[PDB]
Ligand binder design. Sequence first.
Ligand SMILES: [Mg+2]
Ligand SMILES: [Mg+2]
Ligand SMILES: [Mg+2]
Ligand SMILES: [Mg+2]
Ligand SMILES: [Mg+2]
Ligand SMILES: [Mg+2]
Ligand SMILES: [Mg+2]
Ligand SMILES: [Mg+2]
Ligand SMILES: [Mg+2]
Ligand SMILES: [Mg+2]
Ligand SMILES: [Mg+2]
Ligand SMILES: [Mg+2]
Ligand SMILES: [Mg+2]
Ligand SMILES: [Mg+2]
Ligand SMILES: [Mg+2]
Ligand SMILES: [Mg+2]
Ligand SMILES: [Mg+2]
Ligand SMILES: [Zn+2]
Lengths: 66, 83, 90, 239, 101, 98, 99
Amino acid sequence: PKEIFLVELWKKYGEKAQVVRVKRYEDFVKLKARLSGYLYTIRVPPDKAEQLISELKAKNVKVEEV
Amino acid sequence: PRPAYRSRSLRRVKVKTPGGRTVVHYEKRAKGVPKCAVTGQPLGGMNSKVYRFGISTRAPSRPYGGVVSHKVLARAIRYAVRR
Amino acid sequence: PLCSKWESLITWAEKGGNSYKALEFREKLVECIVYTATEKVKKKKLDEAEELLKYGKEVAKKFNIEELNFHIALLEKEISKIRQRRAQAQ
Amino acid sequence: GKRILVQRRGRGGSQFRSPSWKRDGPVRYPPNISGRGIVVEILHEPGLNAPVAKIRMENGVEFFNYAAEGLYVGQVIQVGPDAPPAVGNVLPLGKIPEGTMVFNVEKRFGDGGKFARSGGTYALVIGQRPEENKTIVRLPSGRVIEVDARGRATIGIVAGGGRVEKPFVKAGKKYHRARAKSWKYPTVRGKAMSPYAHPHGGGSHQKGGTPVPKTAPPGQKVGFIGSRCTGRGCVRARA
Amino acid sequence: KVIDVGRVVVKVLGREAGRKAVVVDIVDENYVVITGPKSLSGVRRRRVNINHIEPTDKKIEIKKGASDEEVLKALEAAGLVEYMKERVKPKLFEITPADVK
Amino acid sequence: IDIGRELQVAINTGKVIIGLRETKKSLLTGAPKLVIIAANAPRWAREDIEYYAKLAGVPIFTFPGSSIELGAAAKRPHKIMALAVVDPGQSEILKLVE
Amino acid sequence: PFSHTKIVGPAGRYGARYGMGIRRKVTTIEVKQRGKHRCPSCRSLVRLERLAFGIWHCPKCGHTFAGGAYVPQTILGKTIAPEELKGVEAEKAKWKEAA
RNA sequence: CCGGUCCUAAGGCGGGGCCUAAUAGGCACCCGCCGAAAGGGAAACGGGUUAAUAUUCCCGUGCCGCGGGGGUAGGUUCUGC
RNA sequence: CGCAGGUCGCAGUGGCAAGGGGGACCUGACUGUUUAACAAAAACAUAGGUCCCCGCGAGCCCGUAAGGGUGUGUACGGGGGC
Ligand SMILES: [Mg+2]
Ligand SMILES: [Mg+2]
Ligand SMILES: [Mg+2]
Ligand SMILES: [Mg+2]
Ligand SMILES: [Mg+2]
Ligand SMILES: [Mg+2]
Ligand SMILES: [Mg+2]
Ligand SMILES: [Mg+2]
Ligand SMILES: [Mg+2]
Ligand SMILES: [Mg+2]
Ligand SMILES: [Mg+2]
Ligand SMILES: [Mg+2]
Ligand SMILES: [Mg+2]
Ligand SMILES: [Mg+2]
Ligand SMILES: [Mg+2]
Ligand SMILES: [Mg+2]
Ligand SMILES: [Mg+2]
Ligand SMILES: [Zn+2]
């Protein structure tokens, strides 16, 4: 598993993800793109998390709450 | 296996697992770093710890790279320039 | 400071026009600052963590990185909690 | 059985053989070294009697020599007839001037060197008979011998002298040296044996043996073997 | 002085080590400006520590702050274009640890 | 000629650069009148000084002692491979060239 | 004349074993072996490192060389030294002749 | 992806050759091979499961070697910054 | 690690754990080795001393021989006695 910090970098992997898992906390949300090779995790603020899940569902990537 | 672990060729590492157990992992020791062909000292930029063979290492950007140090290279270049 | 090599690599890549490498170097610089600060705070070396966080604030101002500000805010919240516990116990 | 230890030695058992795998190689002159060379290493060799220099010739051939006393790493040595007779240089005996201290002398050209190869030893170049291509030299024993003038020798004396003056204070020190050499350590006296195992073994008051002739067969040829004499009188008659 | 404008030097350290260049400017006692032209030998114009350059016997006539094509015409006047293109080859087998102590 | 006393006079009165590195830099960039090298100087330093001095046209005198005795003659408590006489103030040190 | 002993200094590790004559021989050799020597190259008074018997090393100038088994230079070895390291004496001779 | 399997050590075996009345006896020579489940040496861990296997089965997360495809940096007289 | 005070017992390193000491002679210097299954020693070995055969195509030894060990060595050395 690999960790990314920049949303712009992380979107390149998340857009090709087989699934995007979402884990929520009081201050931040972990978004985990599961690809064939790696699991890319990014911790984002909740509002940016909502925007990224909306964009991913727009691109028709599967999203699951874990 | 067991006599291979009784020998001290591998490192005995004790680790606590997420299951609450303590286990001993037998891990390899690091390989020696490259040395200068004249002085035998470790070469700068190539002395990171490596634990297995077949890992490509990037030499410093200089003529002769990870073969001789900058001191030997500079002195040899001076001798050749005069000679 | 600690991630000055990352700053120099970022500017060198941007001058050379390597946008992909510039993005990778920005990610590496953020990783440098956030990982070092988080390890310092977990070990409770708050003075070193505060110096790293001030440097990260300057770097985020210099490079326009929002994720650095967000993670710095989380770390400063943790530092405030640690200092509050220390003051209460002492 | 009944075969004595000196008879058992010739079979080539492991306790009598030399562990030459502990050494990097023979210390001999290669056949066709010439020109200038560089002293790159001075090393200890297990079981040998002197430090060994590694010489890297200008054409890439590397060889082992015994280090002259005073030889140092990075030194430039000369090999061949044109080489000056300075220390560390390898010269023909015919070219080497009289009165010179050489070492690793070759009896015939190309054998690698035979005489004056121990630490602190040297041969002295006494004379030159160029009409029979011979060089008269005095060996470390004091014996005067003729050698091939086309043979090679090194100028100087072998380093490591004085190694035997310091006593081998414990039996353990000699044990550790013997493990690197070929010696079987330790040795039982003949008269401490029984008669089946040694000619001197046996009686209630055990005694040594008088000298045996030079024609004595193996197993009988122990003790003094055809000696001209023995003792202080023999040393006096020698001198 | 040896390290002077119009002097042909060889860089000893760094990536461009063993490459020839021409000294075109003087900064101070520690630094001089070299540009043995990057199209010619491969040494881009920049400052260099004088301890990292080895001066040669050869020298050409140019003025302080001389340009790359100025150095080029000076080298072709001296007939030194191929000497500038040649790269110095060290003999690593000769060096012993006494030389780099 | 007292080499030691003249070198003291040159040190106190004129300009004498001490040290192999400073001597090399003065030979490369400055114009010293004389270079003095210790007799037991190493091979690399001896050839470096000889090559640079031959390029710059600056004479080299070989001191008749070692680095230690050169430093002692200069009254420094340390060693001296080489020195550069760049101003002979009140000394006759430059007569050693001949 | 030693750190804590009167006469048996370097041989003090042997206690009362091996005999007075043997211990005296060992002390006599070892006081020269473990003393300070003048390096043949840099002429510094330094404790040279004996890497093996006959192999000596100067920690100041890095001079590695071959010498005696327990002393860096033997009595015979001093007279037959390489002429490269006797440059100071040759300079002294030429100075005394020319002046 | 745990060991063998690979490598060489001390050493050994086979063929050619030489020796031998002769061989199934000897070996300095030449050639090949064998020789370590404690030496050197590619890469896997945690959890769960069975009456009995568990780094082997299952879940999760990976690594190595070999090969291929796409993108990219780079190259396309000449050289990467 | 130390100081002051108080206090109990027959007993305070309270159990556990845990040197008896000294003088003189013989003998082997010492550490070490030895008769697996009746002998551990004053026996053997030992460092040290000394003598002998040997300049290497040597000396000594093994093999029927081919050949081999000492020897990847060289008198500050190999071998052989005391
Ligand atoms: Mg193994
Ligand atoms: Mg290992
Ligand atoms: Mg043995
Ligand atoms: Mg008996
Ligand atoms: Mg008889
Ligand atoms: Mg009999
Ligand atoms: Mg008898
Ligand atoms: Mg095998
Ligand atoms: Mg079971
Ligand atoms: Mg008890
Ligand atoms: Mg006893
Ligand atoms: Mg005992
Ligand atoms: Mg018994
Ligand atoms: Mg008993
Ligand atoms: Mg006895
Ligand atoms: Mg005695
Ligand atoms: Mg007798
Ligand atoms: Zn020195």
